[PDB]
Scaffold this motif. Sequence first.
Motif, PDB file in Angstrom:
ATOM      1  N   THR A   1       0.807  -1.211   0.000  1.00 30.30           N
ATOM      2  CA  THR A   1       0.000   0.000   0.000  1.00 30.30           C
ATOM      3  C   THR A   1       0.845   1.268   0.000  1.00 30.30           C
ATOM      4  N   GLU A   2       0.293   2.312  -0.609  1.00 29.83           N
ATOM      5  CA  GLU A   2       0.944   3.609  -0.686  1.00 29.83           C
ATOM      6  C   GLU A   2      -0.105   4.697  -0.553  1.00 29.83           C
ATOM      7  N   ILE A   3       0.128   5.660   0.333  1.00 30.01           N
ATOM      8  CA  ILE A   3      -0.822   6.749   0.498  1.00 30.01           C
ATOM      9  C   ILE A   3      -0.505   7.774  -0.584  1.00 30.01           C
ATOM     10  N   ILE A   4      -1.409   7.883  -1.553  1.00 37.03           N
ATOM     11  CA  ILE A   4      -1.266   8.790  -2.689  1.00 37.03           C
ATOM     12  C   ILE A   4      -1.708  10.207  -2.348  1.00 37.03           C
ATOM     13  N   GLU A   5      -2.838  10.307  -1.648  1.00 42.22           N
ATOM     14  CA  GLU A   5      -3.410  11.586  -1.240  1.00 42.22           C
ATOM     15  C   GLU A   5      -4.004  11.425   0.149  1.00 42.22           C
TER      16      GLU A   5
END
Length: 362
Positions: free
Chosen positions: A160-164
């Motif tokens: 997972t990656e927090i984009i916004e």
Amino acid sequence: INPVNNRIQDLTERSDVLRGYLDYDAKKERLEEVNAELEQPDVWNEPERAQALGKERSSLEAVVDTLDQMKQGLEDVSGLLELAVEADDEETFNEAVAELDALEEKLAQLEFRRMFSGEYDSADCYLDIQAGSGGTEAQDWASMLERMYLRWAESRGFKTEIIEESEGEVAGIKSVTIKISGDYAYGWLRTETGVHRLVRKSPFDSGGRRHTSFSSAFVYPEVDDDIDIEINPADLRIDVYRASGAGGQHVNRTESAVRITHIPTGIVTQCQNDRSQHKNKDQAMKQMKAKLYEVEMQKKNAEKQAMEDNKSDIGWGSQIRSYVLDDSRIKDLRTGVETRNTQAVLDGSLDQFIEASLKAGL
């Protein structure tokens, strides 16, 4: 015959069905091919291609490696059990059954490949969570959902990656976009699209008043590189904006975050996770292409299911699950699946719902 031995036979039988259904031989042949193309250094001369090959390799190993381990695992367990029984060693028996449980879980999850008929079910995906109009309470709710999905994703081996991310004034978040990457991530997460309803005593209210909050979840697949169809610049408004980091706000005061708005639909995509503005633009652009395809795919599916005239289209904003914490009850409004362990769900236990949803054909 010990019941455990009968279960072993059942698992073997289930794995054999899966081996034929998933074309083990073909996938194994393809896996060698993909591995070969990824060995050469010049493979990244075409970044998009190398990335696609990498994702395909992961998906293939998920089938080939899992089934190989199933074969070996079940044989191991059968041997350990025979030993445990003859020696009357309760502890070895328990260890063997614990391994058997892990094996069945692997198998059961892989059996869901049968449910993934969608063209892009195998793709990575994005999850947008938006707090409803319930102020601080609603923002806390959105943040709880964020935590829930992040924990579930990790439990499934998805990255997972927090984009916004836009935090709330007092607590929680107003919004977040998470990129979930892994084998059939979109297929596994898409049925979570909809409105999630929370009912509890609010920790932000002076009294013990019951509060009902709403947060929306929207899942869309990564299609870039798979769909060359691009967006007309005239239909887009691109804004550079300031996001939010961990104290660092120097080159981050202007931040370099990019927001893209589609004039024809009002849809917006945002990316703030890279230091480079042009990189955030590229990513925000990929998200837009995915959302627009997602939308076109909906209308597309609306025609494939058109009967009555003047019929109202299928909206994705329907309420799909109710979380009544003060009654220790969480129920999916579509499948009827209910659980009384609210903490476990908030901590990421979603398979109980997702599995039921896929089986129901949602």
